[PDB]
XYZ file of C-alpha atoms in Angstrom:
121
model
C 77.092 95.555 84.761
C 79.339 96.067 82.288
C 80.353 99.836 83.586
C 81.864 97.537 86.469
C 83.817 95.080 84.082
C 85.001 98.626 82.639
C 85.898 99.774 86.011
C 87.446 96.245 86.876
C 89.934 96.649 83.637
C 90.656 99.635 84.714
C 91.906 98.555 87.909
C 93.740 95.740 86.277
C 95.712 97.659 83.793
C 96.276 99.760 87.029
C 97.840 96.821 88.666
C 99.925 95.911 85.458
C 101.772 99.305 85.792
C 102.299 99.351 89.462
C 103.908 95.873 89.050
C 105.847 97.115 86.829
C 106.623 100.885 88.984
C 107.121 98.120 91.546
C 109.974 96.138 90.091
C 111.832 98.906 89.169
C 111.997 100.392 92.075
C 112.763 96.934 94.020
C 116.023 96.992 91.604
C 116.923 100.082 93.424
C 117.170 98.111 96.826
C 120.005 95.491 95.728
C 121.039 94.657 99.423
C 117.690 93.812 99.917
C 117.283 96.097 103.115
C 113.464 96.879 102.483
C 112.528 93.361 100.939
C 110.851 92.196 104.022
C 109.304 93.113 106.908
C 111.126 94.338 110.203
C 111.513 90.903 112.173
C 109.502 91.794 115.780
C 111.698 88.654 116.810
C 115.194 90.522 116.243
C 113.633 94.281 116.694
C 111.102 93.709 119.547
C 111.044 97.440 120.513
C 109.764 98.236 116.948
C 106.130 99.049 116.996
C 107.118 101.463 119.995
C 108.701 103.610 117.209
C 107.004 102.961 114.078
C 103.495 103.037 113.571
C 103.300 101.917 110.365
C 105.198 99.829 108.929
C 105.787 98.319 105.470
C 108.292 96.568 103.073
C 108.335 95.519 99.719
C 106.949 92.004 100.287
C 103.675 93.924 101.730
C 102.982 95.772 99.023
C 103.231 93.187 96.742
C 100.369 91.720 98.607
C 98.210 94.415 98.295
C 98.905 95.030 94.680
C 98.047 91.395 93.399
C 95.391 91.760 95.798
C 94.453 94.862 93.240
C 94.509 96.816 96.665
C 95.816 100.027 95.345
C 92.857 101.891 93.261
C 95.081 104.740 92.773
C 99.322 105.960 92.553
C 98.724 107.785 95.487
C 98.041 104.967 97.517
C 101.382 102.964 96.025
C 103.026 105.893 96.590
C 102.121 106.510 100.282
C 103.572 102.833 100.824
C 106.751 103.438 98.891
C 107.313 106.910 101.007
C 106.603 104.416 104.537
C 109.205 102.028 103.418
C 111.905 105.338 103.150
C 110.335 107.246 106.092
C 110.338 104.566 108.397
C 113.784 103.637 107.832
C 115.112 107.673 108.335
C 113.376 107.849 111.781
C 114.251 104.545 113.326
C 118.070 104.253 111.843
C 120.290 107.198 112.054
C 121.910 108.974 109.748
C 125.474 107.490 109.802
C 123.844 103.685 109.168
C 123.887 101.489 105.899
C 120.014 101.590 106.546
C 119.218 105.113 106.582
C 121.865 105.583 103.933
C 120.162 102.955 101.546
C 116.892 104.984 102.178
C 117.850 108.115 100.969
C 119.189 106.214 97.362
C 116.316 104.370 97.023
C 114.559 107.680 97.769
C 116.656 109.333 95.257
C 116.798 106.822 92.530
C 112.866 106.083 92.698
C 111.679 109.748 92.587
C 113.399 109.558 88.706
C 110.351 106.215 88.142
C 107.977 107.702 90.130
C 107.701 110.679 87.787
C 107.437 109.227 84.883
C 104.979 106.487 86.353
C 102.766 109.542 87.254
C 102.554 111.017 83.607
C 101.966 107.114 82.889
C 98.502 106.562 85.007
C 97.213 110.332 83.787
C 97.794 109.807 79.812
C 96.813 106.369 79.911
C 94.101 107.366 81.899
């Protein structure tokens, strides 16, 4: 039909922005802590503490996969990447510590990426 080729667009202008939300908040990560996912190799214990996990690389998966129909879906993987990190790490670690700026620093994209997906529609 062509209400789902409308629907389809939709979702692929979606994706255009969220690449774009994605990048920028990527640039915020410039040791690369949350590029990738948590090697089970190096941290076997992991999955004992988080439940969830994610990383960058994941979610760019999912989002040329057009897997995220909505911000609040990209969002709730952005906000696993930083909550993760604060449970497992402590606070006096370059990890947590990179966390809480790249928790910081994307809240500032985040908001204007929101205003972005309702006026655009």
């Amino acid at each position: 039909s062509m209400e789902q080729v409308a629907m389809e667009l939709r979702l692929t202008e979606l994706t255009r922005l969220l690449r774009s939300v994605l990048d920028q908040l990527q640039d915020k990560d410039p040791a690369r802590i949350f590029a990738q996912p948590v090697s089970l190799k190096e941290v076997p214990d992991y999955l004992d503490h988080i439940k969830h996990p994610m990383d960058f690389a994941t979610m760019r998966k999912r989002l040329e996969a057009q897997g995220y129909k909505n911000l609040h879906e990209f969002e709730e993987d952005f906000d696993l990447i930083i909550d993760n990190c604060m449970k497992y790490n402590a606070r006096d670690t370059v990890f947590y510590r990179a966390a809480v700026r790249l928790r910081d620093q994307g809240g500032v994209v985040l908001r204007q990426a929101r205003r972005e997906v309702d006026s655009i529609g």
